[PDB]
Write a protein that binds this ligand. Structure first.
Ligand SMILES: NC(=O)c1ccc[n+]([C@@H]2O[C@H](COP(=O)([O-])OP(=O)(O)OC[C@H]3O[C@@H](n4cnc5c(N)ncnc54)[C@H](O)[C@@H]3O)[C@@H](O)[C@H]2O)c1
Ligand SMILES: [Ca+2]
Ligand SMILES: [Ca+2]
Lengths: 351, 350
């Protein structure tokens, strides 16, 4: 056995169809009584309906959560949290809404109850990205990790098919990189394989039947396991490269993960063939190429060109991607990253 | 020959690849000297670079434009505009940045120089949507219409393909309904047909080659014409239904248009085929079915089910759609709206 360390993060995860009906219970269980419900404008109706059902347990609704968690919006939300006399936030939405709740918690120590409605997995990580003075920053710590997560697959029936597929691939990316983390451990590896198996099973079913509650349950369960390992162990080339491209070119988040994942996994697979073998088995081939074929079954975007990246962006990106050293089982090398970017730009099937 | 009224409000439209390098000359031409440059948070770097290029003409940068133009943000922007002693706004970016500049102009009478980077078309309409204490409001008037628009297709090369296609269909929707507007007129109809032609030619090419400057210039020209007619004549069933259904079900705006357009046009075309003939000619002979085929070429979503709409939503939708009587060439009947929604939900070809 390889030496390892395993650290369980504190967690209270409530999982069941209709569980968002019991948000009141969870507020009370924390000994709290005044929730500020959070959403984007695209989920404002749902946030308002939840607040309504909470009655006196709902202190207010702030429905202006914004892409990339900009600090000026967070300042406004914190003013809303204070004015409402809130003692917690209930974050109803995807990674952008979870990020707003995390940014409010950073500033106020609000307890967080997160009700995730995508597959991003932020709800079980201690990581927070923000935009300040036009630049995306990242940090992590125990004060960011949400206290309670309520997974209610009914709230995902309405997640559109295209974002369901790319967000599902974003989840799979967390699990795939967990398999070869420098601080990999057997529990994170077991959860990663199970999360991959759940997403590979569920996403093709969700594509054909977005209203199928069984398939939605399975995909949400997979998203939870994938987020848990994002929370637990170190990511590598895939997540670093998505952050570089995402940040420098303003690319759509989940789509960037979907496009890059077959190529970043193929890059590492040359060096980590045994660690990626469970993934290769699940995709019925090579880990990188098999992911590409799986993404094609889902109809996900497959080229960086489709995301608005130009051929003249590839050299500057290969430079930025190699500027700051981090660990990978295969060392990051500029020419090899430049080749990876060219294949992802082309939408080529990994070799 | 139908009677008509034609009204035009002044606007100056500058269109060329690289034109955004010439913003200072446009500000000077207006006799203005103190611009507040506007953007979203993620586009702050671009706004600050533009502001640097403006030199003495830049009075500040305000980079908090938000989706749906919340009054709360507008108040902060107006405080910044007044503190900067500004005389105009330069709205660099998408529809939400155009919207912020309009909301500032309403309150301050600021002149607006818009530099659009999307196909939203807001830069050439007198319409302003805002949100106040969570409620969406809309208004329109000549004071909201931007004075100058600088169209630089080089700024649109990075617009992702998926949103390029669905926002391009949303633009086409303005032009298609302009053809049968109660207050239709020959210039709006001419501009609508040309905008449709431009979109139909350009969008398939953009999909294959998003950095092709010629295709992007053609698409941006189409977006301009489609936005102009949105601002000129009265929309109908298509725009009503999108506003209802996208708004009450919180669906993404462009996608709702993309899905519904073949069905709403097919519905009207049953009654008014002659007004839609110019569009039908551009898409293979039937306007509604032809738009369905066109949207399929682009890879746009084709059903409401794919947008997360549930079977149970269709009923309250049809009722809500018929709550306000409004004008359409074909009488709107709740039954018929229900069936149209069901065909859209299935992704059935009209
Ligand atoms: N800190 C972390 O551990 C972590 C992990 C993953 C992602 N993220 C961050 O999260 C953000 C991306 O999150 P995301 O991919 O979930 O997208 P998102 O939260 O940006 O959501 C995209 C859109 O989909 C809508 N939506 C979400 N769920 C819906 C539902 N079920 N029904 C209808 N509409 C729904 C949202 O309202 C929004 O308008 C990025 O900022 C990313 O960096 C952070
Ligand atoms: Ca805490
Ligand atoms: Ca004016």
């Amino acid at each position: 056995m390889q030496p390892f360390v395993y650290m369980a993060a504190p967690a209270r995860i409530v999982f069941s169809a209709g569980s968002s009906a019991d948000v009141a219970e969870e507020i009370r269980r924390l000994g709290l009584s005044r929730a500020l419900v959070l959403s984007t404008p695209q989920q404002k109706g749902d946030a308002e309906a939840l607040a309504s059902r909470l009655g006196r347990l709902a202190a207010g609704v702030f429905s202006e959560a914004a892409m990339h968690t900009p600090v000026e919006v967070t300042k406004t939300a914190v003013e809303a949290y204070r004015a409402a006399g809130a003692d917690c936030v209930v974050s109803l939405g995807g990674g952008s809404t979870t990020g707003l709740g995390k940014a409010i918690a950073l500033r106020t120590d609000a307890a967080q109850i997160v009700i995730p409605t995508t597959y991003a997995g932020s709800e079980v990580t201690p990581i927070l990205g923000q935009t300040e003075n036009g630049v995306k920053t990242t940090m992590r710590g125990p004060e960011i990790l949400p206290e309670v997560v309520i997974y209610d697959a009914e709230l995902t029936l309405g997640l559109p098919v295209a974002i369901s597929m790319t967000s599902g691939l974003n989840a799979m990316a967390h699990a795939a990189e967990a398999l070869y983390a420098r601080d990999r451990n057997p529990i994170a590896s077991m959860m990663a394989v199970e999360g991959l198996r759940a997403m590979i099973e569920a996403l093709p079913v969700v594509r054909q039947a977005p209203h199928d509650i069984g398939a939605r349950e399975t995909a949400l369960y997979g998203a939870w396991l994938c987020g848990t390992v994002l929370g637990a162990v170190g990511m590598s080339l895939h997540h670093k490269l998505c952050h570089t491209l995402g940040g420098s070119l303003d690319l759509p988040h989940a789509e960037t993960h979907a496009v890059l994942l077959p190529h970043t996994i193929a890059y590492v697979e040359e060096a980590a063939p045994n660690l990626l073998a469970p993934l290769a088995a699940l995709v019925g081939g090579r880990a990188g190429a098999g992911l590409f074929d799986f993404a094609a079954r889902l109809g996900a975007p497959s080229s960086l060109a489709a995301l608005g990246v130009g051929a003249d962006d590839l050299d500057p990106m290969a430079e930025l991607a190699t500027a700051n050293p981090y660990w990978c089982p295969r060392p990051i090398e500029k020419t090899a990253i430049r080749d990876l970017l060219q294949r992802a730009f082309e939408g080529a099937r990994p070799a």
